Ligand binder design. Structure first.
Ligand code: P52
Ligand SMILES: *[C@@H]1O[C@H](CO)[C@@H](O[C@@H]2O[C@H](CO)[C@@H](O)[C@H](O)[C@H]2NC(C)=O)[C@H](O)[C@H]1NC(C)=O
Ligand SMILES: *[C@@H]1O[C@H](CO)[C@@H](O[C@@H]2O[C@H](CO)[C@@H](O)[C@H](O)[C@H]2NC(C)=O)[C@H](O)[C@H]1NC(C)=O
Ligand code: NAG
Ligand code: NAG
Ligand code: NAG
Ligand code: ZN
Length: 869
C-alpha cells in the first residue's frame, strides 16, 4: 500500500530499512519568534550497505522543499531526489535515479519548513510571564520518543546514532542553545546572528535539542572541569542556586561511580515554562519543568527540595544510562528508565544522605506493586510498535519495577560487584546501543564456578506480576510456596532470592528458590521469622498458621526488635494480603495499634496512609457512619503525635514530612485546632498582604484552609497569576481545588482548557486533583467524558496527560454503576479513541475496589465500633 499522490512506497514496514545508515547531520535551523515558524535545511552523510534505488527516513508535518543527493564517490555535485510522503507511517521515500553502490558514502540534503509546534512536542513554542507582567516567547525542542521527525527529516530510531553539527540563526534579543558548546557566532547582513555549535558525539536522534530564548544563567565547574549552567527566565535566576549546587555534586558522583567522565565540556539545565514531560535528558541540554528544577527557600518545602534533587539525579544518570549507552529499541526502554530511577537512590543517598531518600525508596516499589498485582499488568521488557505503544512503555513497570529488581539484584550481589557490573556495561557499550540480554550478561560477568544470574533476572524481566511467597512453620519446618500475587494463577515461576531473620538471631540468612516449592529447616524452634529483610526483594510474603499473629504480637510488645524497613514491609504486606483474601481486615487493623508506639516516621506514615485511605473511600461514598468513626479514631489515637506538631519548618527531612503529613490529616479531618490555626495564619497572610510568611511545610495546608472562603479563594487565585514561584503556584492550585462549590472547580478546569492562566501542562494533574474530592469526583467524570474530543486535540493518546486524565477520574470509582459508565465510555472509544492498555488496568482497578468493599466493608464498620466501645 502507498500514497500520498498515487505512485507507491518502495518500503512498507514502519521500522526503517537497515540498508541506509546515517553517520552525520549538518543541521541548520532558522526560527522566527514573531512569525512563529521556522525554516531549515540538513545534510546527512549516509552509508549504503546493500545497493538500493530509494532512501527511507522519517518526516512529519514538515513541508520538504528541495531534495538532492551528492557524490563523494559516483556523480558530480549533484543530483535531485524525488520525494515521496506516507503519513500513516510517518515516513518519506527519497527516490534515486541511479541505483546506489554498497560501501559508498552519500549526502542526502533537503530544505524543510513548518510552524512552531502548538503543544509540547517536536520544535514547539512556549511563553512565560516576567515580573513586570510581560508575556515572552521561546522556541524549544522535545523529541522522545518519535518527535524529532517533526523538526527535521531523519532516520528516527535509537540505533541510528550519528554526529550532529547544529547551526541556529537568531535575533540580538535571544540566545541559542543546543546539545554542544557554542564554537562561534557570526554577524550577518541584516543585523542577524548565527550560532555555530560544536559537532556532537555519536547519539540517537531523540536527544537532539535546541532552544532560542532570552534566559539567564548561573554557571560553575565540576572537578573534572565541566561547565554546568542553570538557565531560567531572567526574573527567576535566584531560584537556580540549589540546582547548580546539586548538579555539580551529582555529576561528580556519577563520574566517580561509573568511572567514566561526562564526555562533553558543558552541561546545561534549563527550566522550561511550558513543558509536558517532568524533564528530558537531552545530551548536554537537559530540560526541566520549573517545579523539577527551580527552588525558592521562601516558598519551596522540604519535599520540594527532595523532589528537584531527585529529578536532577535522574536526568544526570541518563547522560550515562540512556545517552552514552542507549537501548536498541523502545521495548527495552527499561534499560534507560529503570536504571536512572535506581541511580536516584544510589546517587542521592551518596551525595545527600541528609535528605533521607533511602527510607522513601520502598514507596517506589509499593506504588508499582499495586498495578503488578493486576492481571492487566505487563513484563518489564515487552514489544512496542506504533508511537502510541512506545509512549505506553513509559510507566511504573519500566521505571519503578525496573529500579526495584535491580535493587534486589544489587542486594544479592553486594554493592561493589554490582557496581563493577555497571561500570563494565556502560564502558562496553559506550556510544552504541544495547539489548535487554546484553545487560544481564554484564551484571553477572563481573574458578570455575559461575553466575547464572542471567537465568534469574531473565525471568524477572520477561514475566508479568509479582510473586507471593507463602510460608508455613510447623515447628522447625518451613514450607515455601510461591504464587503469582493477585487481588482476588497458572504458569508463572521466578528464581526468587530469599532473605529472612529469626526471633533469635538478627543475623540475615540468605537463600534462593527456583522450583514451584521447596522447604527449609530451622536451627531453633523459634518465635517468629521475617522473610525479605528491609523488603529488598520484589515479592510479597504471607505467613500461614500463627506466623502473622506472632509477628504482629512482637510489634505490640518490643516493636524495636524488628528492622524499621521490616516493619514498613509487614505493614505494607498485611494490608495487601487482605485485598488478596489471604488475611481478614481486622488482622490488619489490629496491627495499626502498635503505631501508638512507632517512632520511625516511615512505618508510622505507612500505617497511617492506609487508615487515611479508608476514610477517603468511605467519604467518597456517603458512608458517614464509618468515615466518621474513622475520623474520630485518627484524632483520638495519634492525638499525642498530632499535638506535638509545630507550625514551623524545623527538624530533619522526616521531621518536616511527618509534620506536613500529620497536620494535613488533622485539617482534612476537620480537627478544630488545626483548621483554626491555618485559617489564622492564612488571614494574617492576606490581611498583611504577602508580607507575613507561612512556613513552607504548612504553606499548602494554610492555603487550602483559606480556600474555603470565597474571599480567600479569589485572593489565592489572583495571587496565582502574580507569583514567581511555580512551586507556590503548585500549592495554590491544589488549595484552589479543595473547594466545595462546583463552579469554582469548574472554573479551574475551564481555565485549564484555555491554558492561559493555568498552563496546559497542569490540566492532567488538576483534573486528577479535583476528582479525588467527593464534591468534585462527578464533575470531573462528566467533564472528561463530555469534552473528550477537545481533550484529544491538546494531548496524544496515550501521552502521560491523557493516560493520567483517564485514570485520574475513574480509578477511584468503587460502585457497580460507575464501572458500567466507565466500561461504557471505554467502549465509546472504539474509533480514533480506542485503544489504550490503561482501559483494562482502570476497569480491573474499579472492580478490585467493589470487591474490597463487599469482602471487607462491614468488617471495617465493626472493628471501628468495637473501638468506640
Ligand atoms: C521521571 C521524572 C524525573 C521525569 C521523567 C523524564 P525522563 O528522564 O524519564 C524522560 N526521558 C522521559 C520523557 C518522556 C516521558 C513520557 C513519554 C515520552 C518521553 C518522565 O518521564 N516524566 C514525567 C511523566 C512520566 C513519564 N513516564 C512516567 C512514568 C511514571 C510516572 C511518570 C511518568 C514524570 N512525572 O515522571
Ligand atoms: C523574524 O521576522 C521579523 C519580522 O516579523 C524580523 O524583524 C524584522 O526584520 C527586518 C530585517 O532585518 C527589519 O527590517 C525589521 O526592522 C525587523 N522588525 C522587527 C520588529 O524585528 C526578524 O528579523 C526575524 N527574525 C529572525 C531571526 O529571522
Ligand atoms: C562523532 O562522534 C564520535 C564519538 O562517538 C567522535 O569520535 C571521537 O573523535 C575524537 C577526535 O577524532 C577521537 O579522539 C576519539 O577517540 C573519538 N571517540 C570515540 C570514543 O570514538 C567523532 O569524532 C565524531 N565524528 C566527527 C565527524 O566529528
Ligand atoms: C544485503 O546483503 C546481505 C549479505 O548477503 C544479506 O544477508 C541481506 O539479506 C541483504 N539485505 C537486503 C535484504 O537487502
Ligand atoms: C547510603 O550511603 C551509605 C554511606 O554514606 C552506605 O553505607 C549505604 O550502604 C547506602 N545505603 C544504601 C541502602 O544504598
Ligand atoms: C523493648 O525492647 C527493647 C530492646 O531490648 C528494650 O530496650 C525495651 O526495654 C523494651 N520495651 C518494653 C516496652 O518492654
Ligand atoms: Zn528517565
Amino acid at each position: 500500500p502507498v500514497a500520498t499522490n498515487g505512485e507507491r512506497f518502495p518500503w512498507q514496514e514502519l521500522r526503517l530499512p537497515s540498508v541506509v545508515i546515517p553517520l552525520h547531520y549538518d543541521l541548520f535551523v532558522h526560527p522566527n519568534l514573531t512569525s512563529l515558524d521556522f525554516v531549515a535545511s540538513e545534510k546527512i552523510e549516509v552509508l549504503v550497505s546493500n545497493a538500493t534505488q530509494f532512501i527511507i527516513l522519517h518526516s512529519k508535518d514538515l513541508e520538504i522543499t528541495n531534495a538532492t543527493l551528492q557524490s563523494e564517490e559516483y556523480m558530480k555535485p549533484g543530483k535531485e531526489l524525488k520525494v515521496l510522503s506516507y503519513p500513516a507511517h510517518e515516513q518519506i521515500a527519497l527516490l534515486v535515479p541511479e541505483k546506489l553502490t554498497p560501501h559508498l558514502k552519500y549526502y542526502v540534503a533537503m530544505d524543510f519548513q513548518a510552524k512552531l509546534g502548538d503543544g509540547f512536542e517536536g520544535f514547539y513554542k512556549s511563553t512565560y510571564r516576567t515580573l513586570g507582567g510581560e508575556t515572552r516567547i521561546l522556541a524549544v525542542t522535545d523529541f522522545e520518543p518519535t518527535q524529532a521527525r517533526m523538526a527535521f527529516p531523519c532516520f528516527d530510531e535509537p540505533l541510528f546514532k550519528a554526529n550532529f553539527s547544529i547551526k541556529i540563526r537568531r535575533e540580538s534579543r535571544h540566545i541559542a542553545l543546543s546539545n554542544m558548546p557554542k564554537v562561534k557566532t557570526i554577524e550577518l547582513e541584516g543585523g542577524l546572528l548565527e550560532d555555530h555549535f560544536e559537532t556532537t558525539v555519536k547519539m540517537s536522534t531523540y536527544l537532539v535539542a535546541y532552544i532560542v530564548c532570552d534566559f539567564h544563567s548561573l554557571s560553575g565547574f565540576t572537578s573534572s572541569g565541566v561547565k554546568v549552567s542553570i538557565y531560567a527566565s531572567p526574573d527567576k535566576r535566584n531560584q537556580t542556586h540549589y540546582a547548580l549546587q546539586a548538579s555539580l555534586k551529582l555529576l561528580d558522583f556519577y563520574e566517580k561511580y561509573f568511572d567514566i567522565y561526562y564526555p562533553l565540556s558543558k552541561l546545561d539545565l534549563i527550566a522550561i515554562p511550558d513543558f509536558a514531560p517532568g524533564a528530558m535528558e537531552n545530551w548536554g541540554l537537559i530540560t526541566y519543568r520549573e517545579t523539577s528544577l527551580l527552588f525558592d527557600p521562601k516558598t519551596s518545602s522540604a519535599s520540594d527540595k527532595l523532589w528537584v534533587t531527585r529529578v536532577i539525579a535522574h536526568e544526570l544518570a541518563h547522560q550515562w544510562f540512556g545517552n552514552l549507552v542507549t537501548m536498541e529499541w523502545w521495548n527495552d526502554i527499561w534499560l534507560k528508565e529503570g536504571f536512572a530511577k535506581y541511580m536516584e537512590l544510589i546517587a542521592v543517598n551518596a551525595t545527600y544522605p541528609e535528605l533521607q531518600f533511602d527510607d522513601y525508596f520502598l514507596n517506589v516499589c509499593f506504588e508499582v506493586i499495586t498495578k503488578d498485582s493486576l492481571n492487566s499488568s505487563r513484563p518489564i521488557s515487552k514489544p512496542a510498535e506504533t508511537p502510541t505503544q512506545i509512549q505506553e512503555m513509559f510507566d511504573e513497570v519500566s521505571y519503578n519495577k525496573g529500579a526495584c529488581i535491580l535493587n534486589m539484584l544489587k542486594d544479592f550481589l553486594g554493592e561493589e560487584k554490582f557496581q563493577k557490573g555497571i561500570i563494565q556495561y556502560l564502558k562496553k557499550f559506550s556510544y552504541r546501543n544495547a539489548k535487554n540480554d546484553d545487560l544481564w550478561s554484564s551484571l553477572s560477568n563481573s574458578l570455575g564456578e559461575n553466575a547464572e544470574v542471567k537465568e534469574m533476572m531473565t525471568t524477572w524481566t520477561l514475566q508479568k506480576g509479582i510473586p507471593l511467597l507463602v510460608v508455613k512453620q510447623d515447628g522447625c519446618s518451613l514450607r515455601l510456596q510461591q504464587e503469582r500475587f493477585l487481588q482476588g494463577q497458572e504458569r508463572y515461576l521466578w528464581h526468587i532470592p530469599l532473605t529472612y531473620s529469626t526471633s533469635s538471631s538478627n543475623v540475615i540468612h540468605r537463600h534462593i528458590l527456583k522450583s514451584k516449592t521447596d522447604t527449609l529447616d530451622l536451627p531453633e524452634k523459634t518465635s517468629w521469622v521475617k522473610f525479605n529483610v528491609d523488603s529488598n526483594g520484589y515479592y510479597i510474603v504471607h505467613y500461614e498458621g500463627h506466623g502473622w499473629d506472632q509477628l504482629i504480637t512482637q510489634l505490640n510488645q518490643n516493636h524495636t526488635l524488628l528492622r524499621p524497613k521490616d516493619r514498613v514491609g509487614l505493614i505494607h504486606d498485611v494490608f495487601q494480603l487482605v485485598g488478596a483474601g489471604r488475611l481478614t481486615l481486622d488482622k490488619a487493623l489490629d496491627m495499626t495499634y502498635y503505631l501508638q508506639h512507632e517512632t520511625s516516621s516511615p512505618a508510622l506514615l505507612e500505617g497511617l496512609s492506609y487508615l487515611e485511605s479508608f476514610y477517603h473511600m468511605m467519604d467518597r461514598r456517603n458512608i458517614s457512619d464509618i468515615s466518621e468513626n474513622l475520623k474520630r479514631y485518627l484524632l483520638q489515637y495519634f492525638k499525642p503525635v498530632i499535638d506535638r506538631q509545630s507550625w514551623s519548618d524545623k527538624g530533619s527531612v522526616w521531621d518536616r514530612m511527618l509534620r506536613s503529613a500529620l497536620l494535613k490529616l488533622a485539617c482534612d479531618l476537620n480537627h478544630a485546632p488545626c483548621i483554626q490555626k491555618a485559617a489564622e495564619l492564612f488571614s494574617q497572610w492576606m490581611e498583611s498582604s504577602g508580607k507575613l510568611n507561612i512556613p513552607t511545610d504548612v504553606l499548602k495546608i494554610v492555603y487550602s484552609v483559606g480556600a474555603q472562603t470565597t474571599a480567600g479563594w479569589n485572593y489565592l487565585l489572583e495571587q496565582y497569576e502574580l507569583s514567581m514561584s511555580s512551586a507556590e503556584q503548585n500549592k495554590i492550585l491544589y488549595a484552589l481545588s479543595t473547594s466545595k462549590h462546583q463552579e469554582k472547580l469548574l472554573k479551574l478546569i475551564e481555565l485549564g482548557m484555555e491554558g492561559k492562566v493555568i498552563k496546559t501542562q497542569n490540566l492532567a494533574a488538576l483534573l486528577h486533583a479535583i476528582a479525588r474530592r467527593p464534591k468534585g469526583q462527578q464533575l470531573a467524570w462528566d467533564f472528561v467524558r463530555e469534552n473528550w474530543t477537545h481533550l484529544l486535540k491538546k494531548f496524544d493518546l496515550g501521552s502521560y496527560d491523557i493516560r493520567m486524565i483517564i485514570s485520574g477520574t475513574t480509578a477511584h470509582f468503587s460502585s457497580k454503576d460507575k464501572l458500567q459508565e466507565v466500561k461504557l465510555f471505554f467502549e465509546s472509544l472504539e474509533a480514533q479513541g480506542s485503544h489504550l492498555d490503561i482501559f483494562q488496568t482502570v476497569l480491573e482497578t474499579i472492580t478490585k475496589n467493589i470487591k474490597w468493599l463487599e469482602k471487607n466493608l462491614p468488617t471495617l464498620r465493626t472493628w471501628l465500633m468495637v473501638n468506640t466501645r
